[PDB]
Amino acid sequence: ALIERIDAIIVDLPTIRQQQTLVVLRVRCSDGVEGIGEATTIGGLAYGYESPEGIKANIDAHLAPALIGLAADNINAAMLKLDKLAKGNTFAKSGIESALLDAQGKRLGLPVSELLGGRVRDSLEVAWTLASGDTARDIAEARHMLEIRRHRVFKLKIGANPVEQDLKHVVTIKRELGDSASVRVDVNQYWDESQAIRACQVLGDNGIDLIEQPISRINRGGQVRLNQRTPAPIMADESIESVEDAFSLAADGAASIFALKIAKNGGPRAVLRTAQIAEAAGIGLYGGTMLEGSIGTLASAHAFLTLRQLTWGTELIGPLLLTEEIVNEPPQYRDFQLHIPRTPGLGLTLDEQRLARFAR
Amino acid sequence: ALIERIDAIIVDLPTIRQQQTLVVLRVRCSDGVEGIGEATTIGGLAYGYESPEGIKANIDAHLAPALIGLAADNINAAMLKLDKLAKGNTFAKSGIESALLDAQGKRLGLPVSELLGGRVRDSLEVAWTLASGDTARDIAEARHMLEIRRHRVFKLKIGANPVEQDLKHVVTIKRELGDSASVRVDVNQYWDESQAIRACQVLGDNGIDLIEQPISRINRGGQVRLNQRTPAPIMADESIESVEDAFSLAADGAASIFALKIAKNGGPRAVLRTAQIAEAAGIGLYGGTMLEGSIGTLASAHAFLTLRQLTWGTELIGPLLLTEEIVNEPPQYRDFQLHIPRTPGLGLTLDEQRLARFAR
Amino acid sequence: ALIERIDAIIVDLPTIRQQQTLVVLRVRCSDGVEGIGEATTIGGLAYGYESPEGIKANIDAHLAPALIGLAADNINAAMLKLDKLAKGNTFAKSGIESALLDAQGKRLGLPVSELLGGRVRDSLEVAWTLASGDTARDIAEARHMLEIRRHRVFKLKIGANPVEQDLKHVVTIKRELGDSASVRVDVNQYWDESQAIRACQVLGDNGIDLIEQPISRINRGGQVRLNQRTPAPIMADESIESVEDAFSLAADGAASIFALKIAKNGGPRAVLRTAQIAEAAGIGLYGGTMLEGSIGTLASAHAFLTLRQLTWGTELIGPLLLTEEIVNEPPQYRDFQLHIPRTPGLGLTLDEQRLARFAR
Amino acid sequence: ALIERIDAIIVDLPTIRQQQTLVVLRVRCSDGVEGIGEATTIGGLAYGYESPEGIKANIDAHLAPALIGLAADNINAAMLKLDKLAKGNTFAKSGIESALLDAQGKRLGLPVSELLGGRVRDSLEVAWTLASGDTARDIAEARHMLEIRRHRVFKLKIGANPVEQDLKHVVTIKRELGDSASVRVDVNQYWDESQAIRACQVLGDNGIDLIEQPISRINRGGQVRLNQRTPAPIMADESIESVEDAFSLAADGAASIFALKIAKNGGPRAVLRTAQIAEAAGIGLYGGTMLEGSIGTLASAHAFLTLRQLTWGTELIGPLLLTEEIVNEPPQYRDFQLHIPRTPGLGLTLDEQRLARFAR
Ligand SMILES: [Mn+2]
Ligand SMILES: [Mn+2]
Ligand SMILES: [Mn+2]
Ligand SMILES: [Mn+2]
């Protein structure tokens, strides 16, 4: 089996919020098997180097031509060839690898998790991001998600408002929920170390379980210092933009938890390299997401099932934010977790109608 | 346009406290344009290496003669020539650079902030130093400044009295003001690390937002340790006596905030080098002052407007302490900020009458 | 003056050894002034994250729309707005900044170097890369360049062949040329630290003046160790992919020389931030290039003229490799240097005919 | 005895190679005893923060008025009062302290060395700076100084010419002299670490005994690295601008030898603090000079005699460069050393005629 054609499709799907833009990869193999992948980001170029437009342009002009004609079954050789001719471009590489893994799983009749070694679980705990901006509305959304047993872990994106305001908001939510839920925050690099010093103390003293990426990745020593002084553990996300970054942060002791994202590492196999690094150092794990639809969510999930332990769960909620999908199989969210079937590949098939409907 | 003449005038102005001594620079260019600058310090030689007397002596004998005849429009070449023949002498260099930037802005019809790249704001938040020594009098002054909306951020100079006394004073002020104001302290290198250990803890636990230069610049490790243990962030001021010092402190992680002072770095362009260093490391900013009159205040301000972010505001209140000025344009303080116009140069002109009146 | 339109044109120019692809930016301002910039790389995605295709796609979809309507004269505000909405994308940002600086220089009648503060020199020393692969042919090319007084500094790209082979080649060239020329090498991250240990020793012992980027940027400690043990100084290039990286490498002591590249930092102003960082730490400078044509070469050059010192010269030879250009003014290479005129902006104008001829 | 009057006199003396400017201090005490001191520098502001003009201005306006009326016999109280009201200003402080020590020695009938604890030697080894610029001329001067037994240790100021040129020059001199003389160099901060790496190797491999201040004081890590890799020991000079700097460099391991200069530390007593710091760390000593005339030379010498060991000798040759002096007692240079008598104070008296003749 050889790689015959690779198509990168930009798709715009409506959300429950606006719209989320996905880049759907379709890799056609000579044996008739097709693999699907996804390379999605949030906000164009605001949360990463790659945009949907840049992703497609590079796949069409550089990445795809390098794979046409190669063995579809030798994923390692294929991905290494891409590393040789393309620096960075992890999101694009992630979609491509997901597609190849999908096709290979359909080919051998195995789920991607098994191709990756074997799953140790069939479901993953999912955290919900409360984003209404209104405290009361957030507490209500949280009590609802707990009632229908969909989520018991909650994440709050803070940092865009005055520090004191975000702190009042977060503390009130953890106060009202008590130990019924786990409350975590994500500052998305919005604070500088001077703001984080007091902020981390207040959050940790008020029952917040973890503070995700409080300060910018450019401030390495700041991360190392906060990792030593913050009452609540510090998790790295944006600081990891490659597997090599994870090693660096581990050797430095810059975070006690790593967020694992296939798009930021280069694919399901790459994210496993990062997880292995963290495991060798004693660093806790969390399954992250770039708000991908089902393809990317399942591609991530399949990799997370092989992990010995994910101390802090995952946030694979991307499909729940979309009102329309481009796959035929809707994800199974029940009892605070996401359930992954044992069907071949990613266990998904494209809805050609909706794909054509939402493709730009 | 060539530099024709440079005059350094020592001026003694009365304050609302005593008197403040300024060194006014007047640079005459062959195209008829004149630039004005200021090199001021506090207390002769008590807060720095340069005194008004030493500043004038060096400008007349060494610095000025090196510039006469050079292109007034090539500020870089001019300032680099001064670095080559004069070690240190940052205050004097600061006045000279401010004067050249002023003249160049009048020449091209641009405000100094635009010569420096472009402003991202038109006003700066100003902090007021409560200095009566009497707690009740300070709280009263603070409630007054809040009422007329002039200041909502306050700074207290402590360290000259027994530690416990200064702590009682500061805590009482923050207590009475509540979260209506931001209270910060400046110890002016008065404590040794042994005194600061408990002092910083008490201050941080009682709502003080930042502790400025608690210990001496000679104790580097002490700064690094306090930066790691103080509940309230540590800001460096006296430790920065050059741009290279800022790099050093950044690499060491000796403070999470840098005070930017044109006089301590060598001018508006130099202070920007320091700010860039701090930005590259994730270090927060604050616009400092050496209690300069309008010339030096505006020269500082014009540089601070180009900054992406000044997390902790500024303390450009120098003109408010003087009862008489030597410029014709009084500064605009309204709604807790200092407002900077878009007029050419520094946007100031000398009052020849008052200058002659207060010159010694 | 407002930014009215921005066009990103991919141009393919033939070289003396294939073709080089440039992305020409044309920024049209409401006052009728037009600025030109360039965002070029080598080998698609092999020497960086950005390809010509990705660069254009991002400019058309994200970067340009954010600037239309803003003041063309406030470059700082414009570039900071880009940092706020786009992570990375330094090559694209570089072309845009070069274009804005060009237009602003034509507008005020000043050369870009003066907009950047003022030049301290009018020409820059240029190094030539011997790339024939054949030792005898390289020595011949070097003796020729010396005869016509075009180059007296030479750089050799090594690392793609067995270590011993590359070493024999380099040592032979330095031997035949003697102290008539300066011989330097660039390994382009090709070696791992284990290979570099002996390689750096042999090179340093045989008169090679500097070893550029011997090992990969992922190996930080390796860089710090080689910086301490290599008999010949170590220069960082690929390790700097941002201004913040420069600070990091400086604080770490990972290289004694920094290669300055506008494309890797984000523009002429950004490259100056990096240079300032290195200067504050005592790190030597070298003017690098991404093999840009005249636009990018001049944009770089104009920034390097403001530098106090460039201990190791530059490699602004890009135009000499192209057989055809898209500008009307050919660069002046005479007496081992590149000469930069004092004309407004970049001092260049587009040849509409050739542009149309080579645009794809 | 009280301090009645202090006079700072700028004196211009002709040299054997121009003119050297001294600031002579005369402190008059109520008991009729007068003390003389000297605050001299090289090149105005090129080798330090203080110029003769700035030194006099600060003494007349700030330093002197703080001492009038105090006990002339309590030097500690007097010098500490100066530290309290004046930051830096070490050259000025040095002249004043030398004057007070002089007067106190005449008063008690003891040589300054005894006031400082007691001498362990009566003479100091003196090194000669070969400065003709011409290699042959330097070798000739060195063979002459050896013949008349005046100097057997030689220092070469390098760094202003291309590295290779300075290296050829130095190596030739050490080669021709052989082990008849000790050859050392002083780079006066002229090189950056990248240039020093190879330069220090060549110098150390060719018999140069020590390399003084190869790189700038701003590059701290560079000093620490060179201290570890240079085959010839590294001596710090400009890096010490205060006693606290010495501690810092010692704790860092930035140099294996410290140059002791009374002007850079604040006086004969201060220089002893620095020497004590180096001794406690195992750092070797060298008696430096700012090219002072006899007053400053003797003030330095008297302090160096109390030292347990000065591994690398001294460079107290200042008087030998002047054609005219302002004291009545010429210094005794015989048998490679400077001989210090056991007369009271500094053992010098002013020649009122020549003083009046050369005072400006
Ligand atoms: Mn995150
Ligand atoms: Mn302060
Ligand atoms: Mn390179
Ligand atoms: Mn020296």
UniProtKB/Swiss-Prot annotation, chains A, B, C, D:
Q: What is its EC number?
A: 5.5.1.1
Q: Which GO terms describe its molecular function?
A: chloromuconate cycloisomerase activity; manganese ion binding; muconate cycloisomerase activity
Keywords, alphabetical:
Aromatic hydrocarbons catabolism, Isomerase, Manganese, Metal-binding
- InterPro entries, per database record: Chloromuconate_cycloisomerase (IPR013370), Enolase-like_C_sf (IPR036849), Enolase-like_N (IPR029017), Enolase_C-like (IPR029065), Mandel_Rmase/mucon_lact_enz_CS (IPR018110), Mandelate_racemase_C (IPR013342), Mandelate_racemase_N_dom (IPR013341)
BP term (GO), one: beta-ketoadipate pathway
Q: Part of which pathway?
A: Aromatic compound metabolism; beta-ketoadipate pathway; 5-oxo-4,5-dihydro-2-furylacetate from catechol: step 2/3
- PROSITE patterns recorded for this chain? MR_MLE_1, MR_MLE_2
Which superkingdom heads the taxonomic lineage of this protein's source? Bacteria
What is the reaction catalyzed?
Answer: (S)-muconolactone = cis,cis-muconate + H(+)
Q: Which residues bind Mn(2+)?
A: D186, E212, D237
Q: Which residues form the active site?
A: K157 (proton acceptor), E315 (proton donor)
Residue pairs linked by disulfide bridges in the UniProt entry: none
Q: Which cofactor does it need?
A: Mn(2+)
Keyword Metal-binding included in the entry's annotation: yes
Q: What does this protein do?
A: Catalyzes a syn cycloisomerization.
Q: Subunit structure, briefly?
A: Homooctamer.
Protein name per Swiss-Prot or TrEMBL: Muconate cycloisomerase 1
The species this protein was found in: Pseudomonas putida
Q: Which gene encodes it?
A: catB
